[PDB]
Amino acid sequence: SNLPHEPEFEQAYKELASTLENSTLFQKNPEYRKALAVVSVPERVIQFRVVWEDDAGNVQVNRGFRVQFNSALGPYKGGLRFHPSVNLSILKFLGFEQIFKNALTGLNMGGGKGGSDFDPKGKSDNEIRRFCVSFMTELCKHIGADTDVPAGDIGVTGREVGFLFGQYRKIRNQWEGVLTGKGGSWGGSLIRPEATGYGVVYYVEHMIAHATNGQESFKGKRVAISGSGNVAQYAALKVIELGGSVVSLSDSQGSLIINGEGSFTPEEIELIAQTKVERKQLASIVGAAPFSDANKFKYIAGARPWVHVGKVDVALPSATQNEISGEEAQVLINAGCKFIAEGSNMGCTQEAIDTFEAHRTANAGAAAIWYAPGKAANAGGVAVSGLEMAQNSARLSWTSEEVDARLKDIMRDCFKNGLETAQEYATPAEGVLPSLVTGSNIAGFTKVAAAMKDQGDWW
Amino acid sequence: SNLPHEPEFEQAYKELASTLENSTLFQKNPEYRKALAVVSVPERVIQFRVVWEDDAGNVQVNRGFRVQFNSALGPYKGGLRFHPSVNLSILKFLGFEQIFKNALTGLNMGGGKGGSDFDPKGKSDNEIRRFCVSFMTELCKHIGADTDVPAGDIGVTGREVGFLFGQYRKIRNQWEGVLTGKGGSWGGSLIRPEATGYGVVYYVEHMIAHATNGQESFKGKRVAISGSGNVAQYAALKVIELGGSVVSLSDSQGSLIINGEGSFTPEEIELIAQTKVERKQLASIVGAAPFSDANKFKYIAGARPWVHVGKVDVALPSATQNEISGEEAQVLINAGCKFIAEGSNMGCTQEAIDTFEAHRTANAGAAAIWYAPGKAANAGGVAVSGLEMAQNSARLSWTSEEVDARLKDIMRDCFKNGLETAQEYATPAEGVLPSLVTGSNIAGFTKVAAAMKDQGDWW
Amino acid sequence: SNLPHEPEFEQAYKELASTLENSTLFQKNPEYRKALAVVSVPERVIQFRVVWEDDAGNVQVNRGFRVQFNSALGPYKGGLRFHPSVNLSILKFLGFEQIFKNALTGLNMGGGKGGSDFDPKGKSDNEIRRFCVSFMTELCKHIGADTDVPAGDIGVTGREVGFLFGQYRKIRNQWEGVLTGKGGSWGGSLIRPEATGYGVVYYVEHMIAHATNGQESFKGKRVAISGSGNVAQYAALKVIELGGSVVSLSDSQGSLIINGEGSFTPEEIELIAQTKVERKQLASIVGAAPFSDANKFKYIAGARPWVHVGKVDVALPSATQNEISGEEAQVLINAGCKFIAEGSNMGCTQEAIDTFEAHRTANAGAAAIWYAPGKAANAGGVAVSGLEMAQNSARLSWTSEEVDARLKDIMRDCFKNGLETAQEYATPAEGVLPSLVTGSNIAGFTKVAAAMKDQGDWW
Ligand SMILES: NC(=O)C1=CN([C@@H]2O[C@H](COP(=O)(O)OP(=O)(O)OC[C@H]3O[C@@H](n4cnc5c(N)ncnc54)[C@H](OP(=O)(O)O)[C@@H]3O)[C@@H](O)[C@H]2O)C=CC1
Ligand SMILES: NC(=O)C1=CN([C@@H]2O[C@H](COP(=O)(O)OP(=O)(O)OC[C@H]3O[C@@H](n4cnc5c(N)ncnc54)[C@H](OP(=O)(O)O)[C@@H]3O)[C@@H](O)[C@H]2O)C=CC1
Ligand SMILES: NC(=O)C1=CN([C@@H]2O[C@H](COP(=O)(O)OP(=O)(O)OC[C@H]3O[C@@H](n4cnc5c(N)ncnc54)[C@H](OP(=O)(O)O)[C@@H]3O)[C@@H](O)[C@H]2O)C=CC1
Ligand SMILES: O=C(O)c1cccc(C(=O)O)c1
Ligand SMILES: O=C(O)c1cccc(C(=O)O)c1
Ligand SMILES: O=C(O)c1cccc(C(=O)O)c1
């Protein structure tokens, strides 16, 4: 009767719900409508005040959150976002998505998300430390290795994970896998930094192989990426390793595009990584080598990369939600883009999704642009967090090769599940690619819904 | 301003600190001096009264301790010592060492140590049971499988571990890996009894192979060992298995030396083991066969074995701290000893260490006596305890061969790390052996210090 | 066998033990020797590292302690001392005393003591806040309204209690009487600030009334006080209210003596109170009015007040332990002092006590100087803390008059108990005053010892 407006959450919900309705799911099992009503209300939300001291001795106040959305498949799992936009609506969209993403990994992880409106930009490392100490002082009451296992989303790196982990141990007096994205000597997993970007690229490899009947791969393709943080960096590295070209990165202030044919180099990605560790903008490094080379790089203030990259074969938005508009989607199609996968959560606007999906239904086979939703394509991060949990519970670390192999198998299974599910419940016209968004949504949702029923959450 | 004098702890600290100062560590990273000040104050110490009833019905009072020194790398881990010398100073030296030893294993274990001034000698098994029951009644508030995992050091065998484990389960109502050194049917690990002695010998094998360019091994070498408990027994067995000769054992009342050329036999080690299970002295068994054979054995009351064994190639003090004096170190050098490794914690006096290290810097290659500190060489015990924890968390036991293989890999990695670290930070003159004490200390310390920084313990 | 030297604790123990031996206690009940051995080993001690951030952003490290000595009569109870001298020995002397003091109040409070070597002098309020936050972050694991209830001893005021209480609530998520000395709006008791000083004076009133057969009182008497903190301030105020003269106060840097006949005024005590709130020395206020008036005040740097006050009738050391030497005791006797009561814990050296007691046995009636130990005379503070606990458990505050009346009854009962106990177990020669130190010690000890036996601590 009197619920507040939560636009981001409503967007995520509406897209999921629409894909479920536009299938035979509720014809065969109309009772699953009850599951949808129940699943869409989070099990628990904690909000709390975070008072912390700045370097001048002043009192500062921020808001802390943890949404514990669903635990049918496992303990709550998902990142912490420290960004000035953060509110309950955003964290609910993220936590809702997380439920179904986690289901697609095949691991036992429920969905959650948290964070704060604290803005790490402009803060000293000391200020970030004090903030994390205050934040976890409250959060540690509500989380635990078999309860809720956070990690780092936007604004939360290994640095923040460390300060958070330290304070948890201090209060709780237990050394356990309560956070993932931990450091190598204190319970971290090899491949976790790489996991999301690598996984997105692994997933798109299956998309390319399927759409082109094994004729094409990333070798020789031009890939536009947005963001320049954890997901963007490692997606870029994997593309390069597979012989593809990375033709854009961006941040909140502008885009850094490759001028003509060519690619970001691993060395350049490393320099950008070090800049971002220091919480600096791409704009701050384009006045010196190598990024001042105007024949290789064009910095465009205030722009997203999509309309400025020219011809592209693959688009991997890897920054933030709603970062590909309807217009930009049409431009990418016109630029020859045949593959778009979300590194970022809810990276595409609804207008963009509708554009990509309309295009898929109008164009046979490899002529279609194929859209993969984040809950499928970006699941590598949380999957590898699941493996970090597994390693922590075994008290033994695995090799890079072991973790990467499992990650590859998970991304393959996720792709196949979404493809086959779409084929069965939302069968496309002959020659048309099945909807990976529809298939992924149905596959994630039904697994969760049935587990919920088994456990008496609904009946 | 008004801190008490803790001689053993101060000794351990001073030796660590000196080795760090005599390197390039603080030239490259002077901030690590802050880490040293923080790490050297234990996170937590619990002391408690232990009232227990003797077989006559009398009230008896002893003191109980658990030092929880550092948890950056994992839950607190280290043994319990029941010996009349026990006090906070001793347990702090042991727990401080434990931090860096544990770091060298590559497993996620923090450093701790505890115990009591209770003297098991002269007690009935019933008295030991009542004492352990009382002791754990308090200790169980402070320990746990993800918090602090004790085990048996001097005076604490599988018998005491059993009584302790029983009482923990009774109160806490959890069956978990809270202690290691457990029995085979109730969560123990194969190879744990053997682990420390085997590991010391494994480590020395790498020392011999490196110093002699693969030309020598334990085959044909004469090895003087002190103590006759868990570490000494299994070190002796491994030496014998590798074709070496064990020419001494000792206890608190005297030494039992091999008279001439020859060795303790596995059968004789077993008889000594059974004597020690009964808490009897070596002096009590030399009046009968086989130990009354004066052509094989000489019992020397009140003596350590070092000056009485004649020519020796390897010395493995395996009893207690400060059991090789400056004089005894010179005698071992004069007797041709080229390898000395601590089975016992802080087995060498500082005078001994200085003598061994001066000798190493004065003599090229295989001419030097090479000293390996306990934190490197005796780490096999705690390593295998880590694997017992891993097995308990998996709910499945491993084979003897699996545990032993991992132990071998751990001792190899520990040796290599200490060797290469010494080579990099405290580079010896050409032809001179790198300092394993310096390398081990730097390698353990930096790993802990950096994890502490990551977790906000210092900044 | 290998226990560390704890001089202050040994002093407290030896004096108690001597008074018990010099009585008929162990003739009638020799089994109580067993009780003494058990009671003298603390039930539990927690020590912990306290890392805190100074105003420059530097890491600082101090040591934290809580001695939980005895809980036969109630939850552990006693103050926190923040002073650079603090170590385990000091806190054990204090906690040991606390057991028997608490027993004499008639309330259900066990004995404990804690604190830190942190020195509040030279720190900002912000630094003190950060220190208290860090300190309680660990201490809150070990204390609670029905477990252990600390409060403020030397260096710990209502300010520090507030910061400590805040952090406890933050972590533990319980609002309860875990600390006493709390503020008026957040669970404090009327009369708690006044309690110790008032109580000392109340107790001495009974001493005067008894020794002089009701002929004298505080009216017209000259009272030398040491210290200028909580105990000294309110002892001074009560003396003034009863028509006595306060002729000295002191701090760690010197004494401020009344020059001739006259008294500190309540207004002057208030100014000194405000100076001490700011953590400043008496030396800093003698350069201005009213304390620059050399006809009223003499400031003597580096001196205790005892030899500089001339003729005095009552001495109330109210600063710290061992602050009246053997010499100073003889001087006070020579100055006509007939009443000495410890505001401070273990205020008198053993030499002083022996001097006062020898004098009592050599001089009949009112000719003797009468010594009252702190465990009797300074018990008003902890008694009123007991009433603060009672008020917190009732969820209702009492009036100033209610609390003060109970305090008066408690001090009367304590005096009577010590007097009558001395009369029964250590009967003085006819005309000689009974030993209040002996009587107080026996009365406190037997109550605790018998409760311990009832509860199975010894048998
Ligand atoms: N890390 C992981 O494992 C997972 C991440 N994701 C999602 O990937 C995306 C990126 O996360 P991640 O790389 O880890 O985060 P990072 O903080 O490391 O990087 C985020 C990047 O996106 C930019 N960005 C963030 N918010 C905005 C915004 N409101 N407007 C414009 N630009 C913005 C940032 O620019 P700037 O520096 O200027 O602010 C930065 O370049 C997110 O949507 C995240 O939820 C999905 C699955 C796993
Ligand atoms: N057990 C393990 O896994 C580990 C042990 N260590 C260290 O190895 C050493 C031996 O431990 P462990 O074998 O397990 O213990 P045990 O109790 O099984 O045996 C100890 C041996 O050393 C003698 N000993 C102990 N204390 C003294 C003392 N003050 N003076 C003279 N002799 C003494 C004992 O003689 P007696 O019987 O007469 O008292 C006994 O022979 C210790 O320093 C221990 O800390 C190091 C790493 C792992
Ligand atoms: N507060 C209470 O309710 C109780 C207190 N006590 C005892 O009363 C005595 C005073 O405590 P309290 O008034 O509360 O504490 P405060 O900190 O308020 O005042 C302590 C006074 O004693 C001085 N002082 C403290 N330590 C030393 C030292 N080593 N050497 C010289 N002077 C020193 C201080 O001088 P400066 O400022 O220069 O350091 C100050 O004037 C202590 O012995 C305490 O244990 C006994 C029963 C109850
Ligand atoms: O649980 C995680 O490791 C994690 C961290 C950051 C983002 C995500 C996500 O799936 O969006 C998960
Ligand atoms: O943790 C252990 O298993 C243990 C037991 C005895 C000694 C030691 C040690 O490293 O000294 C560890
Ligand atoms: O428990 C208390 O309130 C307290 C505070 C300060 C000192 C004392 C004491 O008895 O010495 C008690």
Size of interface A-B (CB pairs under 8 A): 63
Under 8 Å between Cβ of C368 and C160:
no
Q: Provide CB contacts within 8 A for B442, sequence distance 6+.
A: B19, B20, B23, B25, B421, B422, B425, B426
Dihedral angle of Cα A267, A271, A274, A276, to the nearest 10 degrees: -120
Q: Which two tokens stand for residue C284?
A: 């800093």
Neighbour subunits, C (≥3 Cβ pairs < 8 A)? A, B
For an interface test with A, give the residue of C46, C48, C53, C125 to mutate (most A CBs within 10 A).
C53
Nearest to A393 among B393, B454, B459 (CB): B393
Q: What count of other Cβ atoms lies within 10 Å of the Cβ of residue A169?
A: 25
Domain spans, chain B: 1-186, 187-459
Distance C141 CA to ligand 4 centre (A): 32
Under 8 Å between Cβ of C313 and C339:
yes
Enumerate residues preceding breaks in chain C (C to N > 2.5 Å). Answer: none
- Beta carbon of A229 within 6 Å of any ligand 4 atom: no
DSSP string, C345-411: TT-B-HHHHHHHHHHHHHS-GGGS-EEE-HHHHTTHHHHHHHHHHHHHHHT-PPPHHHHHHHHHHHH
DSSP strands (E only) in A175-284: 222-225, 245-250, 254-258
Q: What are phi and psi of A60, to 5 degrees?
A: -125, 150
Q: How far is CA C295 from CA C243, C257, C258, C261, in A?
A: 21, 11, 8, 10
Q: What count of other Cβ atoms lies within 10 Å of the Cβ of residue B141?
A: 15
Q: Which two tokens stand for residue B16?
A: 């660590």
Range C110-144 burial, b when 16+ CB lie within 10 A, else e? bbbbbbbbbbbeebeeebbbbbbbbbbbbbbbbbb
Q: How far apart are CA B203 and CA B101, in angstroms?
A: 14
Range C327-363 burial, b when 16+ CB lie within 10 A, else e? ebbbbbbebebbbbbbbbbbbbbebbbbbbbebbeeb
Under 8 Å between Cβ of C305 and C226:
yes
- From the candidates C28, C34, C113, C416, give the one annotated as an active-site residue: C113
Q: How close are the terminal C-alpha atoms of chain B, in Å?
A: 24
Q: How far apart are CA B4 and CA C10, in angstroms?
A: 15
Q: How close are the terminal C-alpha atoms of chain A, in Å?
A: 24
Place of tokens 């030494």: B255
Under 8 Å between Cβ of B341 and B377:
yes
Q: Which two tokens stand for residue A354?
A: 């509708």
The yes-or-no answer on residue B453 being catalytic is no
Q: Which two tokens stand for residue B176?
A: 């978990």
Q: What's the gap in Å between the CA of B68 and the closest CA on chain A?
A: 11
Q: How far apart are CA C136 and CA B44, in angstroms?
A: 13
- Side-chain-side CA neighbours of residue A30 (13 Å): 1
Q: What sign does the dihedral C191-C193-C199-C204 (CA atoms) show?
A: negative
Residue B96 backbone class (left: φ over 0; alpha: ψ -120 to 50; beta: rest) = alpha
CATH number of B187-459: 3.40.50.720, 2.40.340.10, 3.30.1310.10, 3.40.50.10860? Answer: 3.40.50.720
Distance B347 CA to ligand 2 centre (A): 10
Under 8 Å between Cβ of B81 and B93:
no
Q: How far apart are CA B117 and CA B90, in angstroms?
A: 11
Q: Which helix (H) or strand (E) holds C286?
A: none
Is the CB of C137 less than 8 angstroms away from the CB of A55?
A: no
A149 chain-B contacts, CB cut-off 8 A: none
Q: Is B27 exposed, middle or buried (0-12, 13-18, 19+ CB in 10 A)?
A: exposed
Q: How far is CA B96 from CA B75, B341, C310, in A?
A: 14, 19, 55
Place of tokens 């309204």: C145
Q: How far apart are CA A412 and CA A299, in angstroms?
A: 36
Strand partners, C152: C80
Contact residues, chain A to chain B, C-beta under 8 Å:
125-126, 129, 132-133, 145, 158-159, 162-163, 165-167, 169, 173-176, 183, 185-187, 393-396
Strand order in the sheet with C314-316: C297-301, C254-258, C245-250, C222-225, C314-316, C339-341, C370-372
Q: Which two tokens stand for residue C324?
A: 């009246």
Indicate the length of chain A as a whole number.
459
Alpha helix positions (H), A325-397: 326-334, 350-362, 374-377, 380-394
In 3D space, the residue among A195, A132, A181 whose CA is nearest the CA of residue A152 turns out to be A181
Q: How far apart are CA A234 and CA A404, in angstroms?
A: 13
Pocket test for ligand 6, best of C161, C194, C385 (most atoms within 8 A of CB): C385
Tell whether omega for the bond before B42 is within 30 degrees of 0, i.e. cis: no
Range C203-227 burial, b when 16+ CB lie within 10 A, else e? bbbbbbebbeeeebebeebbbbbbb
SS (H, E, C) chain B: CCCCCCHHHHHHHHHHHHHHHCCCHHHHCCCHHHHHHHHCCCCEEEEEEEEEECCCCCEEEEEEEEEEEECCCCCEECCEEECCCCCHHHHHHHHHHHHHHHHHCCCCCEEEEEEECCCCCCCCHHHHHHHHHHHHHHHCCCCECCCEECCECCCCCHHHHHHHHHHHHHHHCCCCCCCCCCCCCCCCCCCCCCHHHHHHHHHHHHHHHHHCCCCCCCCCCEEEECCCCHHHHHHHHHHHHCCCEEEEEECCCEEEEECCCCCCCHHHHHHHHHHHHCCCCHHHCCCCCCCCCCCCEEEEECCCCCCCCCCCCEEECCCCCCCECHHHHHHHHHCCCCEEECCCCCCECHHHHHHHHHHHHHCCHHHCCEEECHHHHCCHHHHHHHHHHHHHHHCCCCCHHHHHHHHHHHHHHHHHHHHHHHHHHCCCCCCCCCCHHHHHHHHHHHHHHHHHHHCCCCC
Q: Which two tokens stand for residue B41?
A: 């104050």
Nearest to B456 among A129, A145, A185 (CB): A129
Tell whether omega for the bond before C266 is within 30 degrees of 0, i.e. cis: no
- From the candidates B28, B34, B113, B238, give the one annotated as an active-site residue: B113
Q: How far apart are CA A381 and CA A200, in angstroms?
A: 9
Angle at the Cα of B412 from the Cα atoms of B409 and B416, rounded to 5 degrees: 135
Q: How was this structure determined?
A: X-ray
Nearest to B108 among A158, A162, A395 (CB): A395
Chain-centroid distance, C-alpha B370: 18
Q: How far apart are CA B158 and CA B152, in angstroms?
A: 7
Q: What is the DSSP letter of A290?
A: T
- Beta carbon of B196 within 6 Å of any ligand 2 atom: yes
Q: How far apart are CA A183 and CA B15, in angstroms?
A: 29
In 3D space, the residue among A268, A269, A285 whose CA is nearest the CA of residue A233 turns out to be A269
Q: How far apart are CA A294 and CA C72, in angstroms?
A: 81
For an interface test with A, give the residue of C133, C140, C168 to mutate (most A CBs within 10 A).
C133
Nearest to A137 among C53, C57, C170 (CB): C170
A52 chain-C contacts, CB cut-off 8 A: none
Query: In this structure, which ligand is nearest to the CA of A228?
Result: 1
Tell me which long-range contacts B26-34 makes (C-beta under 8 A, separation of at least 24): B32/B445, B32/B446, B32/B449, B34/B458, B34/C59
Q: What is the DSSP letter of A428?
A: P
Residues lining ligand 1, Cβ inside 6 A: A 83, 85, 153-155, 196, 227-232, 251-253, 281, 318-320, 343-345, 378, 381
Q: Which helix (H) or strand (E) holds A264?
A: none
Size of interface A-C (CB pairs under 8 A): 17
Angle at the Cα of B209 from the Cα atoms of B204 and B211, rounded to 5 degrees: 90
Residue whose CA lies nearest to ligand 3 atom number 5: C153
Q: How far apart are CA A226 and CA A317, in angstroms?
A: 5
B72 chain-A contacts, CB cut-off 8 A: 186
Q: How far apart are CA B36 and CA A324, in angstroms?
A: 51
Place of tokens 């009246």: C324
